[PDB]
């Protein structure tokens, strides 16, 4: 519940590609 989470472990789920990403 609560959709996505701010604090998560490593995996394919990461922030959108950043300029510095």
From Swiss-Prot:
The modification Phosphoserine is found at residues 5, 18. Expressed in a defined zone of basal keratinocytes in the deep outer root sheath of hair follicles. Also observed in sweat gland and mammary gland ductal and secretory cells, bile ducts, gastrointestinal tract, bladder urothelium, oral epithelia, esophagus, ectocervical epithelium (at protein level). Expressed in epidermal basal cells, in nipple epidermis and a defined region of the hair follicle. Also seen in a subset of vascular wall cells in both the veins and artery of human umbilical cord, and in umbilical cord vascular smooth muscle. The modification Omega-N-methylarginine is found at residues 7, 15. The modification Asymmetric dimethylarginine is found at residue 7. Changing residue 18 to A: Abolishes phosphorylation; induces perinuclear collapse or short cytoplasmic filaments. Heterotetramer of two type I and two type II keratins. Interacts with PNN and the actin-binding domain of DMD. Interacts with HCV core protein. Involved in the organization of myofibers. Together with KRT8, helps to link the contractile apparatus to dystrophin at the costameres of striated muscle. This keratin differs from all other IF proteins in lacking the C-terminal tail domain. There are two types of cytoskeletal and microfibrillar keratin: I (acidic; 40-55 kDa) and II (neutral to basic; 56-70 kDa). Belongs to the intermediate filament family. This is Keratin, type I cytoskeletal 19. It comes from Homo sapiens (Human). The chain holds residues 18 to 38 of 400 of the full protein.
